[PDB]
């Protein structure tokens, strides 16, 4: 048994945190005055990880600087951390391809994002995965970690809901899909044809985004380089079940907790859970990231008080309140279900409900704050009311006499936020012919090569399995229609003649390739004769058009003469002096 290793991606390849992510990496956001990277690293250290690799691409300098001062980077830590930086990273697939290129992993590593809050001991799941690998001889490649949860729980936001279908006897995953905006779900018949014993469909699973992987995962990722996310990988592996089966399994845990921070709603849910000791022993007063500033004491109704809080007179702290070090609280305040960062200053007669104030937030008196996040050094002036879901970016100051709406998101950066920040608040064959016509029209506009058009014509004809003589008539009809389609409704001999000039110039090699045999030349005249009747506006104009066949050697003069010799309306139309004049002009020129 080799020592366990874990990969820790420190970048979410998705812009779900504008404008917060524009000046601070998501992984470094303070959940409870502690960075998410600290939480996930502590979780990894607890479960016995001895080697951790962190990949950072966006704002990697700040993550480097913060991490190098952390406890895990100390020489005494049992979790050996290696930091990798590469601006070429664009998705998790690139990260795994790089891992396989450098071959850091030996076997059975852990895949997990950098914003995962968990206290799960995966020893049982790891042992099950290793036993399944040993018995099945390297078939299973992945083991997801899922937690039972009711669908009505706030953690199960509509963005990350997932429905799964597995075999209940061996925990063998059979189907997996998202459920965003879907009122009904679909399941292929295949799931039942293989496992006739039984199939269980589950919707009470919460995606912990934690996976016990294998080097085969990296091998597949570097094989199918189009893969970008873990969901794409699992879908691609499941759809191609017949070849390289490599079935994925899962393990369900119910006595532990785990969830990733995807968006602001999930961030608030995870913060509320963490404050309520749901992630024990990852409680605020434990000070797992040992620091002087983050020390605090626990009291009744989950009230966490830092050093030198200096509480005001008559202020009431109801429940689920975390107070940072060096904070100042005014008189007759009321803060409930909220987290206040260190060094904050609070006015008088304020009401804070389910808000989150980071380091340096200063609030004047009379402000009512509900269900809003205030980034670092944000300031609020007198008598400002914030509706729920409001967001204040770093160093943003809001002036007095304003009631921000529900969707209020403001920042110093103009275009990212919904408002700028400043000291103020205000300011049958027919289908084949149609495909041929579409391809010809597309080729005409795109200036396509003659060879490209010839290949497309051969490809379309071969697929339809149409006869060349029928195709030649179809091509001639389409070509006649194409010159006819050039104008809208001129019904003039000059319009058809002028349009057919450029049309028959470049496409002559295509026409030459289409009709080569003598019988095709006779058929081309027959199609041209039928074209004159179907184009009675240009039917008289066909006398000059018929010369283009001899001009480009498409239809032979003898074949045209034989067509005129053989006789009806068509014979009467061909008997006109206009058709005869073209015949006489060409015959005299010929000899």
Beta carbons within 8 Å of 307's beta carbon, 6+ residues apart: 295, 296, 325, 326
User: Which listed residue (15, 153, 313, 442) binds other proteins by CB under 8 A?
Assistant: 442
| Part of the chain binding other proteins (CB under 8 A), chosen from 2-10, 11-19, 94-102, 502-510 | 94-102
Rounded to an integer, what is the distance from CA 150 to the centroid of its chain?
27
511 and 527 Cβ atoms separated by less than 8 Å: no
26 touches 17 (CB < 8 A): yes
Report the C-alpha gap between 359 and 330 in whole angstroms: 17
The answer to whether residue 459 forms part of the interface with other proteins (CB under 8 A) is yes
For residue 437, the minimal CB distance to other proteins (Å) is 12
The one among 439, 473, 476, 541 contacting other proteins by CB under 8 A: 439
The Cα–Cα gap between 570 and 393 comes to 81
How many residues sit in the footprint of other proteins (CB under 8 A)?
Answer: 38
Nearer to other proteins, 86 or 494 (CB): 86
- Map the footprint of other proteins across residues 119-138, applying CB under 8 A: 138
Angle at 221 between CA 220 and CA 222, to 5 degrees: 90
Which one of residues 255, 428, 462, 567 is an interface residue with other proteins (CB under 8 A)? 462
| Candidate list 69, 88, 135, 489; residue touching other proteins; CB under 8 A | 88
Instruction: Please choose, out of 113-121, 176-184, 220-228, 536-544, the segment that lies near other proteins by the rule CB under 8 A.
Output: 220-228
Site for other proteins contains 455 (CB under 8 A): yes
Nearest to 390 by CA among 329, 401, 378: 378
Judge whether 401 and 380 are in contact, CB under 8 Å.
no
Spatial distance between the Cα atoms of 413 and 19, rounded to a whole number of angstroms = 8
Residue 111 bridge partners (DSSP)? 7, 211
Decide: residue 191, CB within 10 A, 0-12 exposed, 13-18 middle, 19+ buried: middle
- Round to the nearest angstrom and report the end-to-end CA distance of the chain: 95
54 φ, ψ to 5°? -110, 125
Inter-residue contact 209 to 120 (CB < 8 Å): no
Among 435, 481, 530, 534, binds other proteins (CB under 8 A): 435
What track of x and - describes contact with other proteins for positions 41 through 80 (by CB under 8 A)? ----------------------------------------
Rule CB under 8 A: say whether 229 interacts with other proteins: no
Q: Which is nearer to other proteins, 171 or 439 (CB)?
A: 439
User: Judged by CB under 8 A, which of 185, 192, 225, 280 binds other proteins?
Assistant: 225
Determine if 519 is a binding residue for other proteins (CB under 8 A): no
Nearest-angstrom CA–CA distance, 418 and 217: 41
Q: Tell me: does residue 97 bind other proteins (CB under 8 A).
A: yes
578 scored as a contact of other proteins (CB under 8 A): no
244 binds other proteins per the rule CB under 8 A: yes
Contact flag: residue 182 with other proteins (CB under 8 A) = no
Q: Is 239 in the site for other proteins (CB under 8 A)?
A: yes
Rounded to a whole number of angstroms, the minimum distance from the CB of residue 349 to other proteins is 52
Cβ nearer to other proteins, comparing 117 with 238: 238
Min dist CB 165 to other proteins, Å, is: 19
Stretch that binds other proteins, among 239-247, 286-294, 372-380, 407-415 (CB under 8 A): 239-247
Structure tokens at 154: 């706030």
Binders of other proteins among 366-405, rule CB under 8 A?
none
- Which among 242, 224, 237, 245 has a CA at the least distance from the CA of 93? 224
Give the binding range for other proteins (CB under 8 A) out of 38-46, 97-105, 151-159, 339-347. 97-105
Q: Cβ 430 to other proteins, closest distance in Å?
A: 14
The whole-angstrom separation of Cα 524 and Cα 402 is 80
Q: Which of 42, 98, 167, 207 lies at the binding interface for other proteins (CB under 8 A)?
A: 98
User: Residue written as tokens 């970016």?
Assistant: 393
Closest contact distance (angstroms) between CB of 88 and other proteins is: 7
Orientation of helix 60-68 relative to helix 36-46, angle to 10°: 50
Give phi and psi for 478, each to the nearest 5. -65, -40
Q: Are 353 and 371 in contact (CB under 8 A)?
A: yes
Residue from the set 152, 193, 196, 465 that interacts with other proteins by CB under 8 A: 465
Instruction: Give which of 369, 370, 157, 354 is closest to 271, Cα–Cα.
Output: 354
Q: Which residues bind other proteins (CB under 8 A)?
A: 85-86, 88, 97-98, 101-103, 138, 219, 223, 225-226, 228, 236, 239-240, 243-244, 435, 438-439, 442-443, 449, 452, 455-456, 458-465, 467-468
């Amino acid at each position: 048994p080799p020592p366990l290793q874990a990969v820790l991606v420190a970048d979410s390849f998705d812009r779900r945190f504008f404008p917060i992510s524009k000046d601070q990496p998501r992984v470094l956001l303070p959940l409870a005055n502690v960075a998410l990277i600290d939480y996930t690293l502590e979780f990894l250290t607890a479960t016995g990880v001895q080697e951790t690799f962190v990949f950072c691409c966006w704002k990697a300098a700040q993550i480097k600087e913060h991490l190098l001062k952390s406890k895990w980077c100390r020489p005494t830590s049992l979790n050996v951390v290696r930091i990798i930086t590469s601006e070429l990273y664009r998705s998790l697939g690139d990260v795994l391809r790089d891992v396989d290129a450098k071959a850091l992993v030996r076997s059975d590593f852990l895949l997990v994002y950098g914003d995962v809050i968990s206290n799960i001991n995966i020893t049982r799941a790891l042992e099950e995965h290793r036993l399944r690998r040993k018995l099945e001889k390297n078939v299973s490649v992945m083991t997801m970690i899922f937690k039972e949860s009711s669908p009505s729980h706030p953690t199960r936001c509509h963005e990350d809901n997932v429905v799964v279908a597995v075999d209940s006897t061996t925990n063998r995953v059979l189907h997996f899909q998202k459920t965003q905006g879907l009122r009904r779900f679909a399941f292929p018949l295949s799931l039942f044809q293989g496992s006739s014993d039984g199939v269980e469909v589950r919707y009470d699973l919460l995606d912990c985004h934690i996976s016990i992987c294998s080097p085969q995962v990296a091998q597949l990722f570097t094989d199918n380089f189009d893969y970008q996310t873990r969901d794409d990988f699992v879908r691609g592996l499941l759809v191609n079940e017949e070849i390289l089966g490599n079935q994925i399994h899962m393990h369900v845990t119910a006595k532990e907790y785990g969830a990733r921070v995807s968006n602001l709603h999930m961030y608030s849910a995870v913060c509320a859970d963490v404050i309520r000791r749901w992630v024990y022993p990852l409680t605020p007063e434990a000070n797992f990231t040992d620091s002087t500033t983050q020390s605090c004491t626990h009291s009744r109704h989950n009230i966490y008080r830092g050093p030198e809080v200096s509480l005001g007179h008559g202020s009431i702290l109801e429940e689920n309140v975390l107070l940072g070090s060096g904070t100042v609280i005014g008189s007759n305040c009321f803060i409930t279900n909220s987290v206040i960062g260190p060094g904050c200053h609070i006015g008088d007669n304020v009401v804070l409900d389910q808000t989150y104030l980071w380091q340096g937030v200063r609030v004047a008196a009379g402000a009512q704050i509900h269900q809003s996040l205030l980034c670092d050094n944000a300031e609020v002036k007198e008598r400002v009311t914030l509706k729920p879901r409001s967001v204040l970016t770093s160093q943003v100051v809001v002036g007095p006499n304003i009631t921000l709406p529900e969707g209020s998101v403001i920042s110093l950066h103009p275009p990212d936020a919904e408002e700028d920040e400043d000291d103020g608040e205000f300011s049958d064959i027919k289908v084949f012919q149609n495909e041929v016509l579409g391809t010809l029209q597309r080729g005409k506009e795109e200036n396509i090569s003659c060879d490209n058009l010839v290949l497309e014509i051969n490809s379309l004809k071969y697929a339809y399995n149409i006869s060349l003589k029928e195709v030649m008539q179809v091509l001639s009809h389409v070509v006649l229609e194409f010159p006819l389609q050039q104008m809208d409704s001129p019904l003039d001999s000059s319009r058809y003649c002028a349009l057919l000039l450029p049309l028959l110039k470049a496409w002559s090699p295509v026409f030459r390739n289409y009709i080569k045999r003598a019988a095709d030349h006779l058929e081309a005249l027959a199609a041209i004769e039928d074209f004159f009747l179907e184009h009675e506006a240009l039917g008289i104009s066909m006398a000059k058009v018929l010369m283009a066949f001899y001009q480009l050697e498409i239809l032979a003069e003898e074949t045209i003469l034989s067509w005129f010799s053989q006789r009806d309306k068509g014979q009467q139309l061909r008997k006109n002096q206009q058709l005869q004049r073209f015949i006489q002009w060409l015959k005299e020129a010929e000899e």
